[PDB]
Structure 1
Amino acid sequence: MKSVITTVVSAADAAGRFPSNSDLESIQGNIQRSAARLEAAEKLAGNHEAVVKEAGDACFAKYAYLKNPGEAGENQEKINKCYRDVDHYMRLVNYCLVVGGTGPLDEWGIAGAREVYRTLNLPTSAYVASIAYTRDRLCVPRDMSAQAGVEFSAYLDYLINALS
């Protein structure tokens, strides 16, 4: 839950200090940038079944080796468990677009994922090819605002970098 709020409050709690004018000046940027990220949050919250259907079959159009026997996506009950996770990651993008900071992506979807995907033999390049499909399916005047699409694709790039 690394916000702009929880960063400057917990850093002021380590010195044992009152909130000073450097702390309040950081929250003034939260009343400047929140119009773009809450626009992109409500655009994702009303269109999410359309975009995780479009993302997940770009993974299996590229990586068609997964539908082989003995591989990962070999029966129907675990292809449905794959789109479960693309819906899980877009929900965490929508949470961190609300709080304005990478915390919901960090401690609920990333912090332990490399231990899990290796042990269950899940290819993390298939997760990248879904998340980096929606970053360049987006076109900035049609789908959201100009600065709403800046901060939306910037939270996808955190998800591409933490898996790659």
Structure 2
Amino acid sequence: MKTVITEVIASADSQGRFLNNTELQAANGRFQRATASMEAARALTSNADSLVKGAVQEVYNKFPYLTQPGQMGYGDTNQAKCARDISHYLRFITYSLVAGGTGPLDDYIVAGLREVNRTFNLSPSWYIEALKHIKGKVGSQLSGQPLTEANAYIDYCINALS
């Protein structure tokens, strides 16, 4: 699972080599950065409930037709599975924040994304718009390096979906 720590260890191992000053300098970055990351994580964690309901709705407001009958934003089960899915994304964003890398996002959401979305007729556009909205609101929950971190990972998901 990709973190700064696992990456430097992987690179050492693959050259049959003890960790050296290059690799320990790298690790210090990840540790120095934890404070901002983890502040973003705590803010995204406690606002999760509303961030999810905000983004879910915004998917319907931007794609009005989704909420008409015969469509995929209609009925309790679609709308339920949607909230859940955005919640999955925010969850892995917090994990990536806490972990010090994109690993959790890469392993649990990115690997396989398109195949799944294509089989199930899920448009990435919705998910990008959910995330664009989450990005708008996270502008006033955080600032400075915690915001930059939150942004880094939200944007990472949006690029994964384009």
Query: How far has the Cα of 1:74 moved from its partner?
Result: 2.6
CA contact (8 A) 1:66 1:73 kept: yes
Within 5 Å, which residues of 2 pair with 1:1-164?
Answer: 1-139=1-139, 142-164=140-162
Q: Distance in 2 between matches of 1:45 and 1:138?
A: 12
Q: Distance in 1 between matches of 2:24 and 2:99?
A: 17
Q: Distance in 1 between matches of 2:27 and 2:76?
A: 48
**Equivalenced residues, count:** 162
Distance 1:137 1:47, change over 3 A: closer
SS at match of 2:19: coil
CA contact (8 A) 1:124 1:163 kept: yes
Opposite residue 80 of structure 1, the aligned amino acid is A
Q: Distance in 1 between matches of 2:71 and 2:85?
A: 18
CA contact (8 A) 2:60 2:73 kept: no
Opposite residue 77 of structure 1, the aligned amino acid is T
- Gaps (5+ residues) in structure 1? none
CA contact (8 A) 2:59 2:130 kept: yes
Opposite residue 150 of structure 2, the aligned amino acid is F
Question: Deviation per CA, 1:57-81, whole angstroms, max 9, x where unpaired?
Answer: 0110011121233332232221111
Query: How far has the Cα of 1:56 moved from its partner?
Result: 0.9
SS at match of 1:96: helix
Could you say which structure has the higher helix fraction? 2
Q: Distance in 1 between matches of 2:11 and 2:65?
A: 48
Q: TM-score, normalised by structure 2?
A: 0.95
Q: TM-score, normalised by structure 1?
A: 0.94
SS at match of 1:15: coil
- Gaps (5+ residues) in structure 2? none
Superposed structure 1 runs of 4+ greater than 4 Å apart: none
Opposite residue 146 of structure 1, the aligned amino acid is G
Query: How far has the Cα of 1:145 moved from its partner?
Result: 3.5
Query: How far has the Cα of 1:136 moved from its partner?
Result: 1.9
Identical-residue share of aligned pairs (%):
44
Q: Distance in 1 between matches of 2:100 and 2:62?
A: 33
Query: How far has the Cα of 1:138 moved from its partner?
Result: 2.6
Q: Distance in 2 between matches of 1:151 and 1:66?
A: 32
Opposite residue 11 of structure 2, the aligned amino acid is A
Query: How far has the Cα of 1:135 moved from its partner?
Result: 1.1
Q: Distance in 2 between matches of 1:154 and 1:31?
A: 17
